[PDB]
Curated annotation (Swiss-Prot):
One of its GO terms (molecular function) is protein serine kinase activity. This is Mitogen-activated protein kinase 14. The modification Phosphotyrosine is found at Y302. It is found in: Cytoplasm; Nucleus. Changing A47V: In a gastric adenocarcinoma sample; somatic mutation. Belongs to the protein kinase superfamily. CMGC Ser/Thr protein kinase family. MAP kinase subfamily. GO terms for cellular component: cytoplasm; cytosol; extracellular region; ficolin-1-rich granule lumen; glutamatergic synapse; mitochondrion; nuclear speck; nucleoplasm. Activated by cell stresses such as DNA damage, heat shock, osmotic shock, anisomycin and sodium arsenite, as well as pro-inflammatory stimuli such as bacterial lipopolysaccharide (LPS) and interleukin-1. One of its GO terms (biological process) is positive regulation of protein import into nucleus. The modification N6-acetyllysine is found at K49, K144. The TXY motif contains the threonine and tyrosine residues whose phosphorylation activates the MAP kinases.
Amino acid sequence: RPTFYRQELNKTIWEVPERYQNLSPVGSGAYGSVCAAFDTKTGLRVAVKKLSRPFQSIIHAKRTYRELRLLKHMKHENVIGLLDVFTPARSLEEFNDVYLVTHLMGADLNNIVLTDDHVQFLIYQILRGLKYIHSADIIHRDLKPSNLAVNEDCELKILDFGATRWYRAPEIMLNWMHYNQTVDIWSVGCIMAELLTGRTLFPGTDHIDQLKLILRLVGTPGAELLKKISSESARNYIQSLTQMPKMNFANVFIGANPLAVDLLEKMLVLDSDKRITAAQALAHAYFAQYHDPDDEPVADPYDQSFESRDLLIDEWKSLTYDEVISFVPPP
Ligand SMILES: Cn1nc(C(C)(C)C)cc1NC(=O)Nc1ccc(Cl)cc1
């Protein structure tokens, strides 16, 4: 066991292994605070996150176990990955705090403020990462600029901290609960549009306004789409709106790469059943300058059967403690 060392960075107190030097608060979340740090064992600049209330309840505990399982499984250039995970506790009895460590990226996809070149490189990496995580039956469902880490080299990694509705696919707005992975593709679509344009494509004020703005572009749902909506509530809402026609994307996005406007068409389709997938998008002619089907790997199988489990805090804690102890760092 390494020798830890304590210190206080504002309201939050930290106790980490000597290996990590010069901690600097970088921001807070409802799930923990993060500190940029120097890992002397690797010379790398890293980010260290201390989970707020690891096991405050059944939900916090389960979430904590989830946070750990996901990050330990992610091993892709365009996805956040675990460098190290540690705890001050020498036993499960004293186990109350979790610290995750990862590569320090710097700025978010928002900060960066884009030449058609960066746009196709940027979105290309998102899709490359999305293909990977999607291949493990994992849906992000919360994709947006702030959850996209980009370095000065324009390298991108998808991640999940913790607006949002501005990027949510319509079938997750209406409160539907049988949505596929392509909800993420819709977010990509919204993000891509924001880069080529410089404006958030759908700046809605609520779940209703947001849905209106969307339809204002993609148009009202036709016979085939209304036909698949279970919720009489939702169905009656949509049908009760002044019919809206689909717009010509070539017009909406004035003078943008024509190949880029075509991909936007395929990503912002209202019916999740006909929306392009991450894998299929990596092959769109728009990414011909970067696509390489030999370097767009899928993930190893991911066991998420725990997601349907209902356990006590100590069990979710025990499972999490095992996970921290069995961790094996990357090369
Ligand atoms: C909840 N979740 N989901 C994913 C994906 C789907 C991107 C693998 C990743 C995460 N979790 C995280 O991204 N967690 C995390 C940990 C440390 C820092 Cl500094 C920032 C973020």
